[PDB]
Structure 1
Amino acid sequence: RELKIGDRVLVGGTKAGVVRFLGETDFAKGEWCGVELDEPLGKNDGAVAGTRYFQCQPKYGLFAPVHKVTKIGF
């Protein structure tokens, strides 16, 4: 039961958002995921190292692994 774009989840377990993109990063090794935070609790605006993986509001883009992310819709 992996994650799908447009699904509600938690980035890092403490942050909440919606999955936008899933894949590796140009600055981090391994598999990563993109989640749009519900509030300004992120680090990027949907880009990393000059690479935009998805579109999201300012300080709403958070990049965290797929295992670190979980669906909030219990």
Structure 2
Amino acid sequence: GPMDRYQRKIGCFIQIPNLGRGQLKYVGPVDTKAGMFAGVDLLANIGKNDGSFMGKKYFQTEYPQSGLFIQLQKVASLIEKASI
């Protein structure tokens, strides 16, 4: 409430439209950005980051560009369907 239901699914896998399978690793705000975000590990270098942003660690990624922040509203129903 509001983030609790999504936070409980950290570690789940979700299938992101036009991106692929990603592991949910973080849910919350990102410094200097608007809104809430899911931080996902795409398990290939098709993301943007290594789980850090502006010098702060948000989550751990397998590869140097496998992490990605996605606006939470875009994946909120995928997360809700996923099982932990």
Q: Where on the TM-score scale, by shorter chain, does this alignment land: which range? A: 0.7 to 0.9
Q: CA RMSD in A?
A: 1.9
Looking at structure 1, the residues matched to 15 and 54 of structure 2 have their Cα atoms a distance apart, in angstroms, of 23
Where structure 2 has 5 or more consecutive residues not aligned to the other structure, the ranges are none
Q: TM-score scaled by structure 2?
A: 0.72
Greater RCO, CA 8 A, separation 6+: 1
Query: Which structure 1 residue ranges, 5 or more long, are not aligned?
Result: none
Greater helix proportion: 2
Q: Runs ≥4 in structure 1, deviation > 4 angstroms? A: none
User: How many residues get paired?
Assistant: 71
Provide Cα deviations, 1:6-63, integer angstroms capped at 9, x if missing partner. Answer: 111145x322310001000002111111000021100111011111100112111000
Identity %: 35
Higher strand share: 1
Counterpart-to-counterpart distance in 1, 2:49 and 2:15 = 16
For residue 26 of structure 1, the aligned residue among 31, 51, 56 is 31
What are the equivalent positions in structure 2 for 1:1-74 lying under 5 Å apart? Answer: 2-3=5-6, 4-11=9-16, 13-15=17-19, 16-56=21-61, 57-69=63-75, 70-71=78-79
